[PDB]
Curated annotation (Swiss-Prot), chain D:
Listed name of the protein: CRISPR-associated protein Csy1
Keywords: Antiviral defense
Misc note: In this bacteria, Y.pestis-subtype CRISPRs do not confer resistance to phage DMS3 or MP22, but instead are required for DMS3 infection-dependent inhibition of biofilm formation and possibly motility.
First and last residue of the signal peptide: none
Source organism per UniProt: Pseudomonas aeruginosa (strain UCBPP-PA14)
Known role: CRISPR (clustered regularly interspaced short palindromic repeat) is an adaptive immune system that provides protection against mobile genetic elements (viruses, transposable elements and conjugative plasmids). CRISPR clusters contain sequences complementary to antecedent mobile elements and target invading nucleic acids. CRISPR clusters are transcribed and processed into CRISPR RNA (crRNA). Cas3 and Cascade participate in CRISPR interference, the third stage of CRISPR immunity (Potential). Involved in crRNA production or stability.
Lineage, highest ranks first: Bacteria, Pseudomonadati, Pseudomonadota, Gammaproteobacteria, Pseudomonadales
Covered range of the whole protein: 175 to 434 of 434
Quaternary assembly: Interacts directly with Csy2; part of the Csy ribonucleoprotein complex with a probable stoichiometry of Csy1(1),Csy2(1),Csy3(6),Cas6/Csy4(1)-crRNA(1). A Csy3(6),Cas6/Csy4(1)-crRNA(1) subcomplex is also formed.
Length: 331, 80, 297, 242, 325, 326
RNA sequence: CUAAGAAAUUCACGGCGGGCUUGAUGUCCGCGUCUACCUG
């Protein structure tokens, strides 16, 4: 009868390492192994009251009294060294492969039909359409999340470390490659076939990614925050691995899989991140609404159960949602 | 595992570690490392029932170590 | 009831697996009726040979760890259990449990004997301490010594020696080795003062004791409920008419407990060290049996 | 059975048979179960936090114990109860210091940089509880003064236990970093192994008295009786170390 | 005649904890002091993507629930950012004396059981269980998730006799497959060593180390613990460590004698062969191929099972356990 | 035999603390750190028998979808040190035959006569020869003995803060179920027999090293104890170190009885009235059999039939372990 | 002469897959540390 699997979860592919942030001068790019680390340090601030007060408590004698006592926070920040201008971000990405084989299913016929459908998908077309888009989000350095805007020239640079040595190197320039269109270059197809053979499974792929962003002398980089769970106050603690400021290994990699252009009301508003009920919090709302039939769950249950194969512009989405992993069972 | 307020909303969610959000000023105090719960729209406040404590209101009133959660939180369903 | 003459002190009595229940109502430190009877057993085994007389004990309780756990539930505690051997059928046993405790005390005794002149003042403490490393004192064994530094040497002080300044100097010269414990003494005074203050609602004595430990109010120390002896209800029997007694020479009286309250002082803020020697007042005139510490304050 | 005998005043012994009381364990079972959960517990639960029923109390119940009677065999004993499968409570009578925490004695800043730091649970409770007696006890000279003087004496006497508890805690607090703040008072609350090398420093408690009893703590008992108790503590600290 | 009311078997093949560390490749015989991979907190928030029970399948509520975030504070274990090698070291103690249970009730049961086990042992050795307990150390199947997607896994096995070594073994855990049970000129030596270790003919204890060339700064995985944070990891002395019995569960994956199908590879030897991952239970008791109806149909009614199932019914005893209710 | 007669125990042992240090460094075994009780948490499947109403293939697979979650404790050697040091202090008491419970005093003195005519013609040197074997081979090392490469036990006589005489055995060449002669074990047995006969305690401090392996498991004694958390297998810790119980040493000292009617090739069994094994279940020396302790007391002191010397050894060893009889 | 006397709890275990924590901020202003001293 092939009912839906009660418990189903998937191991991910495309793992990113943790991101490291170093600092230096732009002319010393090609010898930047021993650049010092962008350290985190504490500073103090002093705010005011800048929130929308309600209609009741808009008394004149209370607002000046509330701002007479300000709120003295203690913020952590990260600045580049005052003699350095170029921010170096280094992280390594490994490509696992075997995207169909799940982690913990229940029915054997569900698992076998799932692997059969995924084998048909890899048989008719390659992963080439789902690898000319991951290679873009390595090229135009979206993984620099807020450090990208207002940068002078963003040179990203990617190596193939098969052994301890490098196999074949690549340099791009992340502003020649736009943040919206997916072009077709001669050195985004030697990279895309590499991630294609890594995801299909015909080898092992480990990629070293460094990204130099030109921000300026003494400027302010942005690493990712943490939690301030439970006076001695503090706010906005950044995340540093061994006192070197760091982007998380899921904020990086979240920019690896903003691939999804195939979704309704697409008004040229750019790709979003792939998700079941494909949603972004920054836009507030959730696209791929389940009342539409262009979801993920009701796209898998109409392809592994009733075999109604959707358009190839959604089979590029379902497989990519399988590549990020996740839980998919009736929890 | 508590005795909440009089909200009869739905199968609530609860945690004890609580951070304060500032961005998005219609929701305050977003909850951290949160755990699921089910009372399945029971009548009174004490029904929390994580894995073991459903009946025995005397034992529930004995279970006052981490109790009296206020409930007024990010959502009428979601509790403290 | 009379005055001591020599404060014989035992240096460090490590105890293993001693009793912890000690009444129908407490569970803490073992009943100091055991410490009362322990030195009478010690005198009965030694004090006739060295010609001495022992009456009072103090307790210091260097440490105390019970055997309790909580099975992811209440803040009340359950106890330790011992596996029992099989019966004749070899199936199971009707197991009855009791608490345990690793307590570590060092008692100080009280000597009345004339035998301090013929025997030297260190032989009489080198024999008594050597005897009491072969006997039980609450239901647990007494442990020997490891191979480290040795506070296993005891002392033997005479309170009659020296003047008042010399007495208060050797008192500190004894208390300097006894400091990290907590001496425990009777507190029979304030109960029969707290009674008439609490006589408006209910005069039941167990209720007065039960709310002397349960904004919040004030406790003027570390009050504690202890057994304080036995009230008797059955009359005297004959020595040789009762069935299933430990002997057939003494009469018998059935008894219930008698609960009082004590105090866990520090060794410093006591007046002197003749104030905490646990005697046992034992009026049998259709009466009872107690064990207290006179000159308590 | 289980019977004892006690010595008479100047005679032989009397055998005593201590039985199990029942009519005086059920009364404390009733008077203790209701304060755990009941009218006084459920109603006026918040009686001292948010203004509940004023003529009631809180009725705390620390460190209780429980003791079973075989489990699933409730026919042997008498006076049965279906809730009582060995469900008679036990009040505590524990001697204190039954945790044994004062082990490390490190080169910190609270108790290692300052002598009168005293970062302990009982010391912190005694420090927090002296505010009710540290008020204007003008008509409470035995209340804000006598109880305050007794609590000051208790907080002073606890320092001897907080120091000598590490009296065998090591072969000696040697030359190390951070403990130089405790090196200003490295005789009294410090190891043993002539005033400096052949003597201890019996004046650093006078320096720690301003931090503990002055910094953390009417004007008579705040300086006269506290000063006399500090002088007694200094005499006790000086009479021992030499 | 009957089976016993209590019956217990202490385990053999006892493994240690497995300690983790990291460093660089091309460092052979100098890898004694590598720093331990420490765990650390790390905050993570990612929005709701589980299934829905066709009750909140409405756009009025999904946008409301997408704005209630789900801040968690998980742990993680990464290598040092210049270190691309994960070293797992653990010590395995093979006791021997397989048949003798630690407890019983009827001695007429017990000597019959020892008779059956001794007839098995002198009939055919422990060699077929030994050649299968070696290939869960030749290919490092104890590197559970840290194995998949690795450049070159290599295990080195040192048999210790005194404080010093006795024999040293270099393997290559990818040429030795995860599926087929080969026959090499050096796996037979480790095989017969654990054969002599299980037959009571000595006592063997091995120190086994595993190098997994993961990737510099990449992620490795320890065993994960219970909850009373939202993902706790196992730290022995502030060092990340796989569990002991998890190494045990990887070590006894020798069972390739299902009722079902030989085309899916081995699993871990259980009474009811019940992999919790795949959620199904091979060797169902409704079929006559489980363990509990292969014991009392071999030692009470005394019909022998086939020569394949004898290996499984002994290997279920080497894992030990409690039987006979 | 009148109403009550009870014997305070002799051969009283103590707890056994643990430590973990290397080999060829066991001489310095005073500063070795403890072996503490860390915890872990395990996810178990189902491995018990089921009923005939059970074992349908639907309820079984629905059971392995919810495995049990339990948080056991464990204790391991630290991952550099391979040798386990266990340390315990045994004291004997002496005055074996004298009880402390008698309301007869004509039974008491004839009991004294019977134990006196037992001790005069032959000493304690047969029970002592087995009490020394139960410290030579480390039977008190209960589960940690098996599989170790070389157990080595050390025994110190202590009378004052000095040590008096130090022994050094090897618990592997010494068998586990035999009782042979030895040039040192006879002297040790004579020491403990001199302790058992006369008054005043004769004290012993025994340590034992076991070469298990790097970071392996050890097994201290467990402790007896809402199916949600379910912390099972709580070990025993005193002053934060994994401790074997006192009684667990007591059941390994008195493994001396090798005079059973049922089996004499199995090995010794701990002495017991209605002599029973908790593991083997069945109680040897049944009361229907005439080889019971309590029959052999009244036959030897009331009707005064002297049994065989083996049963005399058994009843006097049973008096050594103490007990209570009504 | 001690609520004294007495006591083996044991065996075995897969926690496990997934994730964007974002945005902004003025810490201000005033000040006396003095007096002495034998290291052989």
């Amino acid at each position: 009868i092939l009912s839906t699997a009660s418990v189903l979860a998937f191991e991910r592919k495309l793992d990113p390492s943790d991101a490291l942030m170093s600092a230096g001068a732009w002319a010393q790019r090609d010898a930047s192994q021993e650049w010092p680390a962008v350290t985190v340090r504490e500073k103090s601030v002093r705010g005011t009251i800048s929130n929308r007060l309600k209609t009741k408590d808009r008394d004149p004698a209370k607002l000046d009294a509330s701002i007479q006592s300000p709120n003295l926070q203690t913020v952590d920040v990260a600045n580049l060294p005052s003699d350095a201008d170029t921010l170096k971000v280094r992280f390594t990405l490994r490509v696992l492969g075997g995207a169909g084989t799940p982690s913990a299913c229940n029915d054997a016929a569900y698992r076998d039909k799932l692997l059969q459908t995924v084998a048909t998908y890899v048989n008719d077309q390659g992963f080439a359409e789902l690898a000319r888009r991951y290679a873009h989000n390595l090229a135009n350095a979206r993984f620099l999340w807020r450090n990208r805007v207002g940068a002078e020239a963003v040179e990203v640079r990617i190596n193939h470390i098969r052994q301890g040595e490098v196999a074949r190197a690549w340099r791009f320039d992340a502003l020649a490659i736009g943040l919206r269109d997916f072009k077709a270059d001669a050195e985004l197809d030697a990279l895309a076939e590499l991630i294609a053979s890594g995801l299909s499974g015909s080898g092992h792929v480990l990629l070293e990614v460094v990204a130099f962003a030109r921000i300026g002398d003494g400027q302010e980089v942005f690493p990712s925050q943490e939690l301030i769970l439970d006076k001695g106050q503090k706010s906005k603690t950044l995340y540093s691995v061994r006192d070197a400021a760091a982007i998380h290994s899921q904020k990086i990699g979240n920019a690896l899989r903003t691939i999804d252009t195939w979704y309704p009301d697409e008004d040229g508003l750019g790709p979003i991140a792939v998700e079941p009920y494909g949603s972004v919090t920054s836009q507030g709302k959730a696209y791929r609404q389940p009342k539409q039939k262009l979801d993920f769950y009701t796209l898998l249950d109409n392809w592994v159960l009733r075999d109604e194969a959707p358009a190839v512009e959604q089979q590029h989405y379902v497989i990519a949602n399988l590549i990020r992993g996740g839980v998919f069972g009736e929890a | 595992t508590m005795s909440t307020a009089y909200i009869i909303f739905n199968s609530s969610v609860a945690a004890v570690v609580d951070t304060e959000i500032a961005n998005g000023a219609n929701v305050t105090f977003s909850t951290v490392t949160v755990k699921e719960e089910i009372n399945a729209n029971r009548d009174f406040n004490l029904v929390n029932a994580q894995n073991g404590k459903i009946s025995r209101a005397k034992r529930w009133g004995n279970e006052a170590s981490k109790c009296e959660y206020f409930g007024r939180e990010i959502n009428p369903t979601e509790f403290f | 009831v009379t005055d001591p003459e020599a404060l014989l002190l035992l240096p460090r009595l490590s105890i293993q697996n001693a009793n912890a229940i000690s009444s129908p109502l407490t569970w803490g430190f073992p009943s100091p009726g055991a410490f009362t009877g322990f030195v009478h057993a010690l005198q009965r085994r030694v004090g006739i040979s060295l010609d001495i007389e022992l009456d009072g004990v103090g307790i210091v309780c260097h440490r105390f760890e019970a055997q309790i756990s909580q099975p992811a539930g209440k803040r009340t505690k359950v106890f330790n259990l011992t596996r029992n051997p099989l019966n004749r059928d070899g199936s199971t046993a009707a197991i009855v449990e009791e608490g345990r405790a690793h307590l570590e005390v060092s008692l100080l005794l009280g000597v009345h004997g004339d035998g301090l002149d013929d025997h030297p003042a260190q032989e009489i403490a080198r024999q008594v301490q050597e005897q009491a490393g072969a006997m039980r004192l609450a239901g647990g064994s007494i442990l020997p010594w490891c191979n480290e530094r040795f506070p296993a040497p005891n002392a033997e002080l005479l309170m009659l020696g020296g003047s008042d300044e010399q007495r208060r100097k050797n008192q500190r010269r004894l208390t300097r080795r006894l400091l990290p414990g907590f001496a425990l003494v009777s507190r029979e005074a304030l109960l029969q003062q707290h009674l008439e203050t609490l006589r408006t609602t209910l005069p039941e004595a167990t209720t007065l004791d039960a709310l002397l430990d349960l904004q919040v109010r004030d406790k003027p120390g570390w009050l504690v409920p202890i057994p304080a002896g036995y009230n008797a209800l059955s009359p005297l029997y004959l020595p040789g008419e009762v069935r299933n007694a430990r002997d057939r020479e003494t009469p018998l009286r059935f008894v219930e407990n008698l609960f009082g309250l004590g105090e866990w002082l520090s060794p410093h803020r006591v007046a002197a060290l003749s104030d905490l020697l646990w005697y046992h007042h034992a009026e049998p005139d259709k009466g009872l049996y107690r064990w207290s510490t006179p000159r308590f304050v | 059975a289980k019977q004892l005998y006690f010595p008479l005043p100047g005679s032989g012994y009397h055998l005593l048979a201590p039985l199990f009381p029942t009519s005086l364990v059920h009364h404390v079972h009733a008077l203790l179960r209701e304060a755990r959960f009941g009218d006084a517990a459920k109603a006026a639960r918040e009686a001292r936090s948010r203004q509940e029923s004023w003529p009631h109390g809180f009725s705390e119940y620390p460190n209780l114990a429980i003791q079973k009677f075989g489990g699933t065999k409730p026919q042997n004993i008498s006076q049965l109860n279906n809730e009582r499968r060995g469900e008679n409570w036990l009040l505590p009578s524990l001697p204190p210091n039954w945790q044994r925490q004062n082990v490390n004695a490190p080169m910190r800043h609270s108790s290692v940089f300052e002598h009168d730091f005293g970062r302990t649970p009982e010391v912190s409770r005694l420090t927090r509880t002296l505010q009710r007696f540290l008020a204007k006890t003008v008509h409470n000279n035995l209340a804000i003064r006598q109880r305050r003087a007794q609590l000051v004496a208790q907080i002073c006497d606890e320092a001897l236990q907080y120091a000598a508890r590490l009296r065998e805690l090591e072969p000696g607090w040697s030359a190390t970093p951070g403990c130089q703040l405790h090196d200003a008072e490295q005789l009294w609350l410090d190891p043993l192994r002539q005033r400096r090398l052949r003597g201890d420093w019996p004046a650093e408690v006078g320096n720690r008295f301003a931090n503990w009893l002055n910094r953390a703590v009417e004007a008579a008992q705040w300086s006269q009786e506290l000063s006399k108790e500090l002088t007694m503590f200094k005499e006790i600290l000086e009479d021992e170390r030499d």
